[model samples]
Target: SAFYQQIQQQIEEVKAEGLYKSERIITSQQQAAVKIASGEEVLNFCANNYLGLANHPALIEAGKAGMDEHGFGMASVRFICGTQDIHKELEQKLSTFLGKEDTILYTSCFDANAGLFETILDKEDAIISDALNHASIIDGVRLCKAMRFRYSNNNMTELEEQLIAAKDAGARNILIVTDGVFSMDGVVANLPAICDLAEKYGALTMVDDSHAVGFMGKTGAGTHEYHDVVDRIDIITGTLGKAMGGASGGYTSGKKEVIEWLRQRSRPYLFSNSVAPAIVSASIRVLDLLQESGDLRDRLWENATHFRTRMSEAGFTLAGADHAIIPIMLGDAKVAAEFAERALEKGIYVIGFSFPVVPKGQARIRTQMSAAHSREQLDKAIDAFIEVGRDMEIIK
Candidate 1:
């Protein structure tokens, strides 16, 4: 069919533009050190294993306990013979942990976001979004019938302007939405500013704090805690595939009525099977670990600070603060690619970003920090960066 040829042509176009993504086969558990398909171990600097609990023994045990008690599969959707005691318990734990009134589970945070905007908003309502919000958020907004307004990345003036415009448009129930942290740049959003604007404009607030949940706060509850706006935001959607447990699940925690409505109306929640029991139980264990100590989050910040500062001092341009994500701006796509390959050769696994993923001429090597990384490992990664930097003449 010509349609099949059209699909092939599009695939060729993507490949020609250097946008075809290839997956790396990882052979070991998710941690600071990983064995790839080649059987060589490398210090991983690309995963979201911030607090280093992905493969924790406690989580493993908890998961096994859940499987034994709740079984492996739901075999049905959540509303139809799929709900378990563990599911409700996890929802409660997540709500309590996030300081929200209620919580609902999703197969992934992408689903949580995908189902949020449409269920909560109608044509008369308005959604004010940050331009740099996650792709999930972008897609969710696309699915909604609500009037949409976008502000420049972290620009308070533009955010207020958008809020005013939405107001002028006679929108009811305006919601100001943004990310708690912008992933590519590793910069924390100005939640305080966003909240202030929301209050000033009589609008509700939401944050997708996927990058800030397991770290960034004194207690590591999320960015709301980090910005001291714990009770200000109206909705929060985040993932379990990252720092929390590195499994597969997500949640949307917010006002009780809001969550209740989602449970009643959300398509993904009603249509998808209940989250796997093991993930639910293991995430509960993750919450307990976080509440028990701030040591992991503290270590995470220390590692990030150490890596960021050392790299900056070595004459490499870096981005962000108080975040484990550190982006070393290399400015050229080919050079960024070369740098990542060289880093891999030096036994440090890192990823590079270029145009389309980031702004044109703003290519970077995005490195993530894990609390599990020792001081020596961090130093070795730093040394590798310097060696690669000098080899490429990107830094002196």
Candidate 2:
């Protein structure tokens, strides 16, 4: 009774502090234009359907065929009765696509990250992590027995110092970890510099490329490929939930020994059921599609450039480089929320992110570009943003 009352009190406190989160239900399929639960159609600028394949007929057909041929749920972990031919095939294809010696699948990238450090490293190891890595990475590091050192986001000097410290501490093994792309700020990590530091200090490097894997490099390999350090980074973890078919699955791709070790020892992989057959089959098809053409990637980049240029010209401070993620900074949390609300009212769908998600006073409306977005749709969203910004006095 006391616990219930305390939890209820905490919920109210969260609301009063303007930190409570509410989900906006999307009733339609995942696409550039979506219907909300309110029955209104809005142009979506917040989804991770980067390649516009969330509703692609090919993927849907592949999923259906996989279900017909292989059945749906695995109902058992990989070591049990769950490992299917498609599972191995998908893993092999991913290894080829990512240029890794081997790859292992997971239920989600979160689980992949969660089970990584703890399984392989011991107390004698040290984990030097970037301060702004994903929550999964931070949690995984916490669960491991290694000594941890954190450097400022993308700060090369700080990273080197941490490496030196780990070396001086007589660490038997040192691993440096970072996200390929910082999701909130839309910035790519300096992988080249990171790999150099790892090499200089005799440390291993790992990148969680969830946000950049399916659409960053020349052929959509990932940040490592984009940074021209493909073989330099020792390990990479990524998700298939974003640009790759936009469904759910993730994998850790690396040396054969690491992959084999995780297969035998990782708690999440050993306990969790294998990725569904439908997802596995469809994911295999997704890799084939990506390998077949660069049209989708090119279009996505064009759209990102168009939006970034127009938004900046409209006098909004946008963050990130020439990437799909664009954060339009609005300092106050309430103001950012208000801006999103007005934009939704005008048929443009977006959300405001504030403190705790990002640092305090760096609240922003993060807009993501999709290959599915047409030029006219882009113009309409930008125009609606301009109207809302002006009405809220956020822009001149």
Candidate 3:
């Protein structure tokens, strides 16, 4: 088993380099608090469950109801025998909610991104992407035959330059792709400026609003609505696995022609299994929940502001905005690891990011907020962070 031995050697090397990634086994449901397999209950601060709907009773019930009504799985691809009525219903609902002309679903936003570029862009086209877009976007761009240009993360000037480069290179059509909110920094993209630049360059705009889609605007529409450019952008892709219901699914929503073309050409859509009945049903309920009120979205911001303000007052160097993602910079990866470990011991669970995931010397712990978290829970996590930081000498 030389091959297996080689895999073991690589894994060991990864560990030795402090770059090995591992997952913790959770024995409880995803919520503001979760239980580790070791029977330890911790105030979880690192999940993407911003709306706290991951384990909501309504979602759980609806999921089962959907399964009961839709009968488990589609058992075929969309074009074959998978086109269920609920599938079309969900797609229509998403289109209306997102303010798009049409919509399409994928098993995950990862597949949506993987299926996007190549399906739309050709050698005659160009894609100018933000340098720090998600890995899925990078891979999608690579799969495309289009000319590629990368601008520095949210650097409007650099973006303009790249657009000019693309134009000078005689790109027939151009698309400016970016994440609506950069997860690592949690800074919302300058979409107003981006839209202006796109207009000047005669380019189409696209946003992968995975982090901003569910609770971004007053109506919980997304970043486009947050920036008041809903009618301006040409393409949008988002996930249901985050704030929607946190079960699993994603989508691409945009103009009628873009969706029509994708249906005829997107590889992942053609090959991937149809999304399950449970998720689709639950997602429709999620839309219903969103349309019902903005209560959860408002509470989520309240918690984020409370945590960030208190953490800042505690003399912690935090990165990000009024949005939920909070990064406590620890400078060194080892320090981040120690901080996370210490926080876990304090029963406040969080994780650290270092080189490879984030840039070198910029290691830190990323904390996420949940609407389900009580004020007491927020205080507890904040207290744990303060205690661990002082204990580890990360802050005075």
Candidate 1 lDDT score relative to the true structure: 0.90
Using all chains and alpha carbons, the TM-scores for the candidates as numbered come to 0.98, 0.98, 0.98
| lDDT tens digits by residue: candidate 2, 1-396 | 999999999999999998888888889899989998989999999999999999988899999999999998999999999999999999999998888999999999999999899999999999999999999999888899999999999899999999999999989999999999999999999999999888888999999999998898887989998998999989999999998988899899999999999999999999998999999999989889988988889889998888888989999999999578899999899899999999988999898899888888999998998998988999999999999999999898
lDDT of 3 by residue, 144-225 (tens): 9999999998899999999999999999999999999899888889999999999999999999999987898878788899
Ranking by TM-score: 2, 3, 1
- How does each model score on lDDT? 0.90, 0.92, 0.91
Candidate 2: which stretches are off by over 4 Å? none
> What lDDT is reached at residue 107 by model 2?
94
lDDT of 1 by residue, 354-381 (tens): 9888999999999888998988999999
Relative to the true structure, candidate 2 reaches a TM of: 0.98
Return the lDDT, model 1, position 290: 89
State in Å the error of residue 180, model 3. 0.7
